[PDB]
Design an enzyme around this catalytic site. Sequence first.
Site, short mmCIF file in Angstrom:
data_model
loop_
_atom_site.label_atom_id
_atom_site.label_comp_id
_atom_site.label_asym_id
_atom_site.label_seq_id
_atom_site.Cartn_x
_atom_site.Cartn_y
_atom_site.Cartn_z
N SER A 1 -1.87 -2.65 6.12
CA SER A 1 -2.41 -3.77 5.39
C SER A 1 -3.61 -4.33 6.11
O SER A 1 -4.37 -5.11 5.52
CB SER A 1 -1.32 -4.84 5.17
OG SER A 1 -0.97 -5.44 6.42
N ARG A 2 -3.81 -3.90 7.37
CA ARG A 2 -4.93 -4.31 8.20
C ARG A 2 -6.18 -3.44 8.03
O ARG A 2 -7.26 -3.84 8.47
CB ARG A 2 -4.53 -4.37 9.68
CG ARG A 2 -3.73 -5.61 10.08
CD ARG A 2 -4.64 -6.75 10.54
N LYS B 1 5.79 3.30 11.29
CA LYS B 1 4.49 2.76 11.66
C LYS B 1 4.69 1.56 12.62
O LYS B 1 4.12 1.50 13.72
CB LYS B 1 3.71 2.36 10.39
CG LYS B 1 2.54 1.34 10.58
CD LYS B 1 1.33 1.97 11.23
CE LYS B 1 0.17 0.96 11.31
NZ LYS B 1 0.47 -0.07 12.32
N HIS C 1 0.86 -1.18 0.00
CA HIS C 1 0.00 0.00 0.00
C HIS C 1 0.90 1.22 0.00
O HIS C 1 2.11 1.08 -0.10
CB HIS C 1 -0.93 -0.06 1.22
CG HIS C 1 -0.21 -0.23 2.52
ND1 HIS C 1 0.64 0.73 3.02
CD2 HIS C 1 -0.21 -1.24 3.43
CE1 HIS C 1 1.13 0.32 4.18
NE2 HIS C 1 0.63 -0.87 4.45
N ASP D 1 -0.97 -7.22 -7.80
CA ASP D 1 -1.00 -5.79 -7.51
C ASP D 1 0.41 -5.38 -7.06
O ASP D 1 0.91 -4.36 -7.52
CB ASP D 1 -2.04 -5.42 -6.43
CG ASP D 1 -3.50 -5.78 -6.83
OD1 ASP D 1 -3.76 -6.11 -8.02
OD2 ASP D 1 -4.39 -5.74 -5.94
N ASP D 2 1.03 -6.22 -6.21
CA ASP D 2 2.36 -5.91 -5.68
C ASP D 2 3.36 -5.65 -6.79
O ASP D 2 3.96 -4.58 -6.82
CB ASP D 2 2.88 -7.02 -4.80
CG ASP D 2 2.09 -7.18 -3.52
OD1 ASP D 2 1.21 -6.34 -3.17
OD2 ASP D 2 2.37 -8.20 -2.86
N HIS E 1 4.22 1.32 2.13
CA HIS E 1 5.32 0.67 1.38
C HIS E 1 5.86 1.53 0.22
O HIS E 1 7.06 1.53 -0.02
CB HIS E 1 4.90 -0.69 0.82
CG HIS E 1 4.40 -1.65 1.85
ND1 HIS E 1 3.06 -1.89 2.05
CD2 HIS E 1 5.06 -2.44 2.74
CE1 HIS E 1 2.91 -2.78 3.00
NE2 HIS E 1 4.11 -3.13 3.45
N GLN F 1 2.59 -2.46 -8.86
CA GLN F 1 3.02 -1.25 -8.15
C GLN F 1 4.52 -1.06 -8.23
O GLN F 1 5.00 0.07 -8.38
CB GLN F 1 2.55 -1.25 -6.70
CG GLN F 1 1.06 -1.44 -6.59
CD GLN F 1 0.44 -0.71 -5.42
OE1 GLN F 1 0.35 0.53 -5.41
NE2 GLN F 1 -0.02 -1.47 -4.44
#
EC number: 6.3.2.1
Lengths: 275, 287
Positions: B195-196, B158, B42, B86-87, B45, B90
């Site tokens: 990611s949560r 984070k 996300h 997706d990873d 990252h 990106q």
Amino acid sequence: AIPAFHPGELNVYSAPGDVADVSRALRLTGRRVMLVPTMGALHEGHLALVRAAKRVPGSVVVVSIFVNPMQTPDDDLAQLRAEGVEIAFTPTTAAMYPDGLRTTVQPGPLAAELEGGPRPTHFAGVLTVVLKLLQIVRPDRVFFGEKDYQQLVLIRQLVADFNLDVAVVGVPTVREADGLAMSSRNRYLDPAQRAAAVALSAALTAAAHAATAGAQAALDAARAVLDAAPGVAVDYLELRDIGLGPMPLNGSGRLLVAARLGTTRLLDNIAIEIG
Amino acid sequence: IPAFHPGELNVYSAPGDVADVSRALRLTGRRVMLVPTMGALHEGHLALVRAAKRVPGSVVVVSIFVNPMQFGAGGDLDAYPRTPDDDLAQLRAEGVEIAFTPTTAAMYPDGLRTTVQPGPLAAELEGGPRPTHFAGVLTVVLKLLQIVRPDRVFFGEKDYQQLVLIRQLVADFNLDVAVVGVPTVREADGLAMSSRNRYLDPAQRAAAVALSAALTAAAHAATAGAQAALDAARAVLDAAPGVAVDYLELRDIGLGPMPLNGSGRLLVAARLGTTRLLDNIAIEIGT
Ligand SMILES: COc1ccc2c(c1)cc(CNS(=O)(=O)c1cc3ccccc3o1)n2CC(=O)O
């Protein structure tokens, strides 16, 4: 600015930062960096490690001398100078542990067996310091005696498990004329004890030859030799595969023994081929 | 050396492949940057990627590996978000040249054996009820650093306790890598990227702003001292519906065996339904 390094001379560093800098600098000029970790009080076993390292073409030999609290200075330095060694690394406890005991290496389950019975955190200390020394020096190869075979196997596990970029070279045990494995502890033995101590190596060598007749013959032969010595209290006598797992039916193995003579604990081990 | 095509995303699964490529890049004068991730990438990252990209002459390595060793039950492990398509897309969009996607078998061919034992910070806060969690993280991060051998490694603030533990790892094992902490990226309302966040229903997502509101309220209250900062944060968390607080603690910035002075870190963990959210913020006390 790189610390001074004089080629062909014994250069002594105590700051881990300094030896890190010289090692990196040396690697960049075509030297292959060899590490020989020692706890000082050097003897012929230690010089055998040095000699093995010295014979790699383009080698520079780093000998570390560090008394690990978790696992003769001028005498030692003269021997190394005499061996044509170029770097001695001699750090203080504070330099190695500036933040004290904090992150450590936890050995796998092998560390709980054999020598890990009388000393269950001994190996954590050893692997913790060896990992630190590896990261400071970043050697191409690191040299350990087969004398401390279980230690050597744990170091090979460390290297594999943490994907370390170094070759681990195990050097055959240097022995006195009668076969006794070299060790600093040997000087504490009285003459009766020192004569009895020869039973460890005698048993193991008898076992290696008996092994044509099988694993049982090998073990019974070693036990008979140890049983012929007075005052030799055997802590263990164990046949294992070369990585110290259970001994395969036939094939390559290691036979390890440990014994107390008065208050001195002695160890030995030997290659065994079964059949 | 396997193929490495500059300006393109090169994906390696074998540790030996990335290690060889990396060493060869370093020997050519490129500086190697590592961003260790567990995938499900996300914007948090991407901030780490961007920080790494802006190091001059950098080649950027992103690792994606859901590390079994830092999970408690296999249940946790199976539930972890996996979105590898997706990873990679990106990463391509960001101009990353290396993705390192090892198999579990390649990372742990002998199962669990030699491991990293963290210092006592690993037993506090997130580590309290998860006593092997940080051992699992430090073990895999040590392995990644040894495989990749980067000049710099990037971690988010984070996961602040994690970042501190990595700094300890690096100091205590004499690792020759600079650890770079990247400030937390937030949603428009202040919600820390994570990611949560995908597990929050609409009610929960609304309520979740209370963590960052509480922390920023505390950071400004802190001119009036620690107790005021703490009570401000607590009031905001209490005024939020369906927010069960697990901990709210003000520690020294190193989180260590040292009393808080002027500069601290305020940390919160809270439950919204089944979703556990964390956030933290720098706090200056009595300013
Ligand atoms: C090649 O013939 C032999 C014969 C016997 C040998 C050796 C070689 C080497 C040793 C002892 N190992 S060590 O002192 O070099 C050591 C330094 C060190 C530093 C950090 C961690 C672990 C470490 O272990 N011994 C046996 C002995 O002295 O008892």
